[PDB]
Structure 1
Amino acid sequence: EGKIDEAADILCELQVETYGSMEMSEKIQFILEQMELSILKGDYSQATVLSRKILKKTFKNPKYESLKLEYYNLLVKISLHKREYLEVAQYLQEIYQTDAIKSDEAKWKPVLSHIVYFLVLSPYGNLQNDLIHKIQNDNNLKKLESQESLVKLFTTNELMRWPIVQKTYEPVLNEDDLAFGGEANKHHWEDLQKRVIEHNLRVISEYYSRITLLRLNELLDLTESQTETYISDLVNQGIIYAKVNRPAKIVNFEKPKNSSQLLNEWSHNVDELLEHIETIGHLITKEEIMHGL
């Protein structure tokens, strides 16, 4: 009949008070479908609350076929209103081992590209280094080595070829009809461009100690007003800290002076001469044997 809000409100006002927790076969299946009605309705809070009930109970239950596949789709669909690529990357850790054990490489290869998509677009995290090696990688695959190089690309990326890379290969990048939704590709360019700038300034600080602000603007592919936006965001959120001088046009790493000088840093001067007494100990034994005989 063309009803959206009315179709969702019927099941939400019934299924909650219906089941007495007797048969979980039809209950779990319809709750997963109840979240689908909230997707068409546009309520992210309804699906978020329903995802805190049977999700933990399913973990204790054994793995099924049609039941487990519904969790992987809904956790991606709830990212429309959430727009967080870090949380979905943790939700895809179960399907990563599911397609590599239960299923075959036919469905495992495309999902591998999706997992990288949520990792590249993730703002930050402590698991990003653990997701570089993963488990099943080094499988000698073109799609596996291409997506893996994009993870380590953030270090050497100058943002010169960034628009070129997405146009040449666009599996998850520009045109993606799987695990994504929207009316245009603007969500692909806006979300990816903001991340590659944040991930770029992280390695630049770890390498360049003091760099000119004029040369720095050319590496970010931004302007004077655009460069100050990403710098103020990383410092206010507690990501990185550096020195920015507008009149001097000099960017510095802001090395901490709290090391107490010779109370700490002097430990590097003793290690300069420390290895001598060890190497001499190995040489005294070896020199007398070969030269004497």
Structure 2
Amino acid sequence: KEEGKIDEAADILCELQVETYGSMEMSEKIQFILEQMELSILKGDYSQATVLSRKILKKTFKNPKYESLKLEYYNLLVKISLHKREYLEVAQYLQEIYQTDAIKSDEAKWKPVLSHIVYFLVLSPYGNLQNDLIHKIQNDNNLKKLESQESLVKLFTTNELMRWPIVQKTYEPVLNEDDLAFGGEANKHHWEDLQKRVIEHNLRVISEYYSRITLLRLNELLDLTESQTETYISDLVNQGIIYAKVNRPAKIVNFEKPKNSSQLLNEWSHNVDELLEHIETIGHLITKEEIMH
């Protein structure tokens, strides 16, 4: 390690454990393979690291003699999908760390973990996965001790309109003090990534409330030009999170999946049945009041 031969050490030790196992204890085996993953971060093959992580089962972590090992292991899997810039995977891993008994009970240890889940979940691509998980975060009473963190998630959980140089100005002197997703020369590209997600968050809000909005007005909203607005709408319909049709003359961008005749009419039946019910219940409470008065 102390030598400039650290990369060479990645080669020797990774090959060795494919030939060597023996009868050693589970704690020792785990420790070599985590060391090797650490030497493969330094070698610059994170993908190689992944293959070594799938050797030890995750079921092997469930007992408390390996409790410390579980912590380092997840944290290595954070670094590895971070490097490839998959923030959905990094979001899920820090959640594994949170549920582990050492982190959860010690007051100090959960703090930086809870702050990091939250920063990464927002950076995730809007999935069905991101949805279920963000509103789990709110259920917890841990979250309420933190205040900078509480407010960061609180925007995205509800539906509202916001803009990027508002987010940018506000959260820059605050969260550039904390690392991971900020500062640096490659983590400014993880900050950079929140500009698209802020834009994507607006597109979802606008989708629900407007069904026809002008494409010329949409550009103003997002703070973008017409080209860029187009690219954001395209990629968001593709994932299956919105639906739209854009009219290039610039008259309308229409967010809606057009409804069948049968769909609109089935809702009209539902109103009629409910109106007949309302008149009934009123009629019974009128009979009551004649005795009272």
> What's the TM-score once normalised by structure 2's chain length?
0.84
Note the C-alpha offset of 1:97: 2.6
Of 124-133 and 36-45, more deviation after overlay is shown by 124-133
* CA distance in 1 between partners of 2:59 and 2:157 (Å): 41
Query: Residues 92, 262 of structure 1: CA spacing in aligned structure 2 closer, same or farther, 3 A cutoff?
Result: closer
Indicate if the aligned counterparts of 2:244 and 2:255 stay in contact, CA closer than 8 A: yes
The 1:262–1:185 alpha-carbon spacing in structure 2 relative to 1, beyond 3 Å, is closer
Separation in 2, partners of 1:189, 1:179: 6
1:33-62 CA-partner distances (Å, limit 9, x unpaired)? 110011011112211111112242433433
Greater shift after overlay, 226-235 or 151-160?
A: 151-160
SS in 2 for 1:58: coil
Structure-2 separation of matches of 1:49 and 1:283: 70
Tell me whether 54-63 or 217-226 shows the greater mean CA deviation.
54-63
**1:97–1:262: structure 2 CA closer, same or farther, 3 Å change rule?**
closer
Provide Cα deviations, 1:210-234, integer angstroms capped at 9, x if missing partner.
1111211111121111111111111
CA contact (8 A) 2:199 2:222 kept: yes
8 Å contact 2:135–2:157 — kept in the other structure?
no
Task: Indicate the percent of aligned positions where both proteins have the same amino acid.
Answer: 100
* Secondary structure, counterpart of 2:260 in structure 1: coil
* SS of residue paired to 1:264: helix
Q: Which moved more, 1:95-104 or 1:172-181?
A: 172-181
How big is the shift at 1:81? 3.1
* Offset, 1:155: 7.3
Work out which structure has the larger RCO, using CA pairs closer than 8 Å and 6 or more positions apart in sequence. Answer: 1
How far, CA to CA, are the matches of 1:16 and 1:34 in structure 2? 12
What is the CA deviation profile of residues 120-145 of structure 1, one whole-angstrom value per residue up to 9, with x for unaligned ones? Answer: 10112224343344368564867634
Q: Which residue of 2 aligns with 1:261?
A: 263
Rate the CA distance shift 1:46–1:185 in 2: closer, same or farther, 3 A. Answer: closer
Taking the aligned partners of 1:230 and 1:215, their CA distance within structure 2 comes to 15
Given that 2:175 and 2:182 are in contact with CA atoms closer than 8 Å, whether structure 1 keeps it comes out as: no
Q: From the superposition, tell whether residues 233 and 127 of structure 1 become closer, same or farther in structure 2 (CA, over 3 Å).
A: closer
Helix, strand or coil at the partner of 2:253: strand
Structure 2 contact 245–255 (Cα < 8 Å) conserved: yes
Q: Which runs of 5+ in 1 are unaligned?
A: none
Cα RMSD after superposing both structures: 3.1
Secondary structure, counterpart of 1:105 in structure 2: coil
Partners of 2:11 and 2:164 in 1: CA distance: 45
**Structure 1, 125-134 or 22-31: larger mean CA deviation:** 125-134
CA contact (8 A) 2:212 2:255 kept: yes
CA distance in 1, matches of 2:236, 2:116: 26
* Equivalent-residue separation in structure 1 for 2:77 and 2:263 (angstroms): 51
**Alpha carbons of structure 1 residues 118 and 174: separation in structure 2 relative to 1, 3 Å:** same
SS at match of 1:210: strand
Asked whether the equivalents of residues 213 and 249 of structure 1 are also in contact (C-alpha less than 8 Å), the reply is: yes
| C-alpha distance in 1 between matches for 2:183 and 2:147 | 26
* Whole-angstrom CA distance in 1 between matches of 2:24 and 2:102: 34
CA 66–171 in structure 1, closer or farther in 2 if over 3 Å, else same: farther
Change (3 A) 1:169 1:257: closer
Report deviation, 1:99: 6.4
CA deviations on 1:225-277 (whole Å, 9 max, x unpaired) are 11111111112232211121121431222342314266423224414523334
Q: Is the 8 A contact 1:154 1:200 kept in 2?
A: no
In structure 2, list runs of 5 or more residues that go unmatched.
Answer: none
Deviations 1:159-215 (A, max 9, x none): 765334344435895454358895344313321112221222112101112111121
* Aligned 8 A contact 1:75 1:91 in 2: yes
Equivalent runs, 1:1-293 vs 2, <5 Å: 1-62=3-64, 64-98=66-100, 103-134=105-136, 139=141, 144-154=146-156, 161-170=163-172, 173-174=175-176, 176-178=178-180, 183-260=185-262, 263-271=265-273, 273-291=275-293
Aligned residues of 1:79 and 1:88 also touching (Cα < 8 A): yes
State how far apart, in whole Å, the 2-side matches of 1:261 and 1:66 are. Answer: 55
Contact preservation (8 Å) 1:113, 1:171: no
Query: What is the number of equivalent residue pairs in this alignment?
Result: 291
Asked if the contact 1:12/1:34 (under 8 Å) is kept, the reply is yes
Distance across 2 between alignment mates of 1:229 and 1:197: 11
Shift in alpha-carbon separation, 1:122–1:178, aligned structure 2, 3 A: closer
Q: Cα 1:137–1:171, aligned 2, differ >3 Å: closer, same or farther?
A: farther
In 2 relative to 1, CA 55–8 (structure 1 residues): closer, same or farther, beyond 3 Å?
A: same
